[PDB]
Amino acid sequence: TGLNPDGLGRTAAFSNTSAESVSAVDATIDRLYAQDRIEIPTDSRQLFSTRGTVLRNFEDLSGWTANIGSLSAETSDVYVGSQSARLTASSSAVDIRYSFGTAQDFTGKGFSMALKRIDVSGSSDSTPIKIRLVDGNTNYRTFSARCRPGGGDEWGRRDFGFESEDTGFDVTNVQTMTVTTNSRSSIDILVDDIRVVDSSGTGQVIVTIDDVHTGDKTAAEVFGRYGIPIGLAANAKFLDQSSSKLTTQEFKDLLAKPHVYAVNHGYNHYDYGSYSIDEIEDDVIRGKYELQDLGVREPNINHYVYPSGNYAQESIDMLSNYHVMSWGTGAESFDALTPNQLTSPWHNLRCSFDSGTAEAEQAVNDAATYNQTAHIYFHSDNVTQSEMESVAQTINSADVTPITLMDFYNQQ
Amino acid sequence: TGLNPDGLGRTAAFSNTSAESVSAVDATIDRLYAQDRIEIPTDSRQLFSTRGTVLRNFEDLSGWTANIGSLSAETSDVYVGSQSARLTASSSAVDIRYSFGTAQDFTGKGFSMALKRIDVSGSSDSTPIKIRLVDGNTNYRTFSARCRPGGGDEWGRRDFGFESEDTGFDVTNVQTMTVTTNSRSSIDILVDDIRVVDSSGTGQVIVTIDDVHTGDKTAAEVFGRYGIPIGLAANAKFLDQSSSKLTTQEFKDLLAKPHVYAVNHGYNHYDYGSYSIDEIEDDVIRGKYELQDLGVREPNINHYVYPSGNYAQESIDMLSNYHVMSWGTGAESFDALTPNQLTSPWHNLRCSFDSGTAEAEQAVNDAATYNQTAHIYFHSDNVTQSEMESVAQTINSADVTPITLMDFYNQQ
Amino acid sequence: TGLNPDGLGRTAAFSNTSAESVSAVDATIDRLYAQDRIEIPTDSRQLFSTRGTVLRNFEDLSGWTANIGSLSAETSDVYVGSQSARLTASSSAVDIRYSFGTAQDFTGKGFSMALKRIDVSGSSDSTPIKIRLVDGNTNYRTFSARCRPGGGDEWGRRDFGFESEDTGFDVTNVQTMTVTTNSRSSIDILVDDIRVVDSSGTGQVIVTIDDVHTGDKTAAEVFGRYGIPIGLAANAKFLDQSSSKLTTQEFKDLLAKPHVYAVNHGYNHYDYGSYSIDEIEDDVIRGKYELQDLGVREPNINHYVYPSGNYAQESIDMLSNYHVMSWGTGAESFDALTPNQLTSPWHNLRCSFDSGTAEAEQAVNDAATYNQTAHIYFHSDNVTQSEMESVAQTINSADVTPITLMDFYNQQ
Ligand SMILES: [Mg+2]
Ligand SMILES: [Mg+2]
Ligand SMILES: [Mg+2]
Ligand SMILES: [Zn+2]
Ligand SMILES: [Zn+2]
Ligand SMILES: [Zn+2]
DSSP states (O other), X not given: OOSOOSSSSSOEEOSEEEXXXXXXXXXXXXEXXXXXXXXXXXXXXXXXXXXXXXXXOOSOGGGEEEEESEEEEESSSOSSTTOEEEEEEEEXXXXXXXXXXXXXXXXXXEEEEEEEEEEEESSOSOEEEEXXXXXXXXXXEEEEEEEOTTTTSSOEEEEOEEEEEOTTOOTTSEEEEEEEEOOEEEEEEEEEEEEEEEOOSOEEEEEEEETTBTTHHHHHHHHHTTTOOEEEEEOTTTTTSSTTBOOHHHXXXXXXXXXXXXXXXXXXXXXXXXXXXXXXXXXXXXXXXXXXXXXXXXXXXXXXXXXXXXXXHHHHHHHTTTOSEEEOOBXXXXXXXXXXXXXXXXXXXXXXXXXXXXXXXXXXXXXXXXXXXXXXXXXXXXXXXXXXXXXXXXXXXXXXEEXXXXXXXXXX | OOSOOSSSSSOEEOSEEEEEEEEEEEEEEEEEEOOOEEEOSOOOTTTGGGOSEEEEOOSOGGGEEEEESEEEEESSSOXXXXXXXXXXXXXXXXXXXXXXXXXXXXXTEEEEEEEEEEEEESSSSOEEEEEEEEETTSOEEEEEEEEOTTTTSSOEXXXXXXXXXXXXXXXXXXXXEEEEEOOEEEEEEEEEEEEEEEOOSOEEEEEEEETTBTTHHHHHHHHHTTTOOEEEEEOTTTTTSSTTBOOHHHHHHHHTSTTEEEEEOOTTOOXXXXXXXXXXXXHHHHHHHHHHHTTOOHHHHTEEEOGGGOOOHHHHHHHTTTOSEEEOOBSSHHHHEEOSSOSOSSSOOOEEOSSOSHHHHHHHXXXXXXXXXXXXXXXXXXXXXXXXXXXXXXXXXXSEEEOOHHHHXXXX | XXXXXXXXXXXXXOSEEEEEEEEEEEEEEEEEEOOOXXXXXXXXXTTSTTOSEEEEOOSOGGGEEEEESEEEEESSSOSXXXXXXXXXXXXXXXXXXXXEEEEEOOTTEEEEEEEEEEEEESSOSOEEEEEEEEEXXXXXXXXXXXXXXXXXXXXXXXXXXXXXXXXXXXXXXXXEEEEEEOOEEEEEEEEEEEEEEEOOSOEEEEEEEETTBTTHHHHHHHHHTTTOOEEEEEOTTTTTSOTTBOOHHHHHHHHHSTTEEEEEOOXXXXXXXXXXXXXXXXXXXXHHHHHHHTTOOHHHHTEEEOGGGOOOHHHHHHHTTTOSEEEOOBSSHHHHEEOSSOSOSSSOOOEEOTTOSHHHHHHHHHHHHHTOEEEEEEOTXXXXXXXXXXXXXXXXXXXXXXXOHHHHHHHO
């Protein structure tokens, strides 16, 4: 035992102690048996924010022309440097453009930008924001991301997915770059700090299945036919609730298959806005430990997927104590697509194929074509076996590496 | 000190506590002094299992020709997808061939495959399994790995070491690939999911010395002449037992040398089958903490070398709580060799040079020539100083990077 | 709660416990809430020491000729192998030369060497040591590092920054390697194990600001104008001391900016030699936990910058329990400079630009030109805003990636 430790207050020398909960200011442990971390040491929020090189700076707007809408310096609400740029428009799209002092070669370069939504209203309270490159021939190439409420309420980087290209665009001879939106009754959004990242590696695909439906069994068989790895974005309360969701044994048996892995999606799927940050934190913590009891270990259980795609900087700050990376939701090919090097592991989206495989298969083919990473997702109740087989065969026939979320985060 | 925590049961507010053992469900620690992990958060077993791309699928056997032996679909027992290939043969080898719809280029690629042993019997209950590529000239190039009892009793991936090449083989212009065994009185094995991985980097060499014999001093001096890293696969009980084993001070002094590092080999060298999984787990745990007391810290002490080379999925499952990677034993060049990218950190072997340096020097030259990683090993009682000098000069003269196990795992 | 644990001595079954300090031999924790590590599991001291390939081993001095000074095989005192080279000179420099058996190509290679100071005296206690390549035209190219008291008192690898080049030096056709010093009344230094590492990737810049002076606000704006990331080498006691040092809220606000990160510099700036190792360890530990309370999380708070640049192997040994990487100080361009691949994360220096920007802007231009990493530093009280703008524009105009210390360590 020894004698009692040094000091005042209740001090005790024990042999063996059992407790439900231990709070300690400091703990000196000679040998630690604690593989099941809830609270992770890594804060991922700002690690990736300053990768690559700043291509466009916004610190002086003399080089930018407002083509449509309006542009002004914002020196109070600054992402980086001395100022950011306010983009503002009424009943109109905004389009601003910058002309290079010499021809730019952007072969193997992906694009990223800082964004904050102040106001957007019209056909949606959101807009696609599009980085358009333009060549010496006036062909465009478009990369895009979504400015939304919640996830855009505070400054956050988007890593832009390929969207479209005018046939024969000369990426070696880019003469201007342009930033533009859909038209709305009101637009007020801030931007800053455009970054260029090396994306010269192969294209890559990530597949996630949400919400632990019984069809995940047939999904695992289908995507298994080409060794494509599936992430089960798992809610542990949903297991054994009904015939429509996996049993505990089915989930464990699925995760034993070498291509299936689990990521956290909250114990009871508590989404942002629908619940308080505290209740979501409990859902996150409980999701983590329940999945760890089901054998989901560290590199896997460091990933989270936003319940119902809802998020904000509030939820990101909370989640950063427990997870390193998270994914939202979108309907279109550019939502799935990111450069291979991220600059935010929190803000990026996934393309749904619950509504039809077109946008996902467009993303997979574009991932191959333009050397990008595509994240595609579904619920296995919504999607038929034939739809899964279309996507699986698209991925097998494309020039992409199918990868886990763990692999993708390890590449950063 | 404060007042007692919220709750029923025995609750206590302490200042300073000492314990031999603490069991907690929840531990909230504001500052952690616990560098010596026993139980690691990372589960390496299935992380690497979906690296690279599935080259050959076994999901439809219409494309496979049974040259010798016999081939059938297994659908009750499947690594990946809807099916796996059963290979069955009597008083013969099995050899199955797939002819490509167009010429294949495998320059800088390495190969991997999923395997399970159902039965093998004859002169040995084990076989080399060989992936043979064949060119437009009918030159072969062969890579291989071993199907063994224990390590093949459940599905596991092998990552295939180069073995042989017919002079002038055109790796750019492969027309067919072949899976084949040695001849045996009975063969019954399942295969699935052949994977191609990028191995276009330089060749690499890893040297391990097992069981802490006193000759490790001369070994350290010899391999030190060319700064080649030595892994001591260490049993901490063996230190100070006899004049034939290192003293504690000698072992610490060896590890202070910049090229020497320690990996776990069980406190008392308990091996699979010879002892229960529980006893081996205790030996693994004690090995880890005794070596940590001797100063062997995290990236080093995350590696384990199987005692007497014995293992199975039972032991891998247990070891995955404590270690990230383990290595078995073999006698030939294709044992030492792997692609630079593994798909299993658990199933791969090492070539002995206890009996003679030939197959190890072959492995080093193959690693240089064909861009692969070679792991070579010995006991320093079995090997004379001039034999070590032959191997050390072989490594120094070859085009390979000599690396640590830590470096190799960080590259995955 | 359950019944009391197995054992003699004081045993207890608790529900909820609170403690200031817990000492445990074994802790079995089912769910760990301990993001704030003080003791890190990783021991970085010898991980990188045996990267790359040994070029000159000094294990046979038949190939070496003294141009000036004297040389012997040191067999009593050896970094690597059977021997080291003892370099000794009186009232003179030393310069020793090895002729290559053929034209070496060192395009994209960087250089590293083991060093120990026995004695250096005269005009200084210390010397630049230069690795000095000679081409087929008798042009030199020079890389260098500093031999000093303290940091050189025990064997430690230096990774050599570019220093100078005779115009038109053919790096593809190198004919002789030379090792040389400044002239001194006494020189007695041991060298061993010259290593070659691949540094063919892009050049890189790391910017650190020391000692939390209020000018860090203007620095954040200036380097922010180009998205270059700043490391605050932070002392947590200094916050709120004076108008001349940041407030706690200013420091937190600074670290919320995506390009500003914090690294430890000791709670109260206790430097080696000035205080005992125990006092410095307390300063290191308190620095770590106070900065963790300010929100500085794991990958950031795993870096430490030496207070007043003072260090030895004693401090490195102690620091290795808490940090992975540390940086000293120097006045000149080669002090900033390293290959992209280190071999010691502990012995490398930073170039001051407190005394004018010239040597740092030389280092930035050389980082671009020769594909190297440059670490530059200042105190924001010493440096005017125009000097910061000169450095910031130098970095933005150069061909370098500006990076965090975290990014740099993740690349190793
Ligand atoms: Mg700005
Ligand atoms: Mg299969
Ligand atoms: Mg030596
Ligand atoms: Zn969901
Ligand atoms: Zn052994
Ligand atoms: Zn300082």
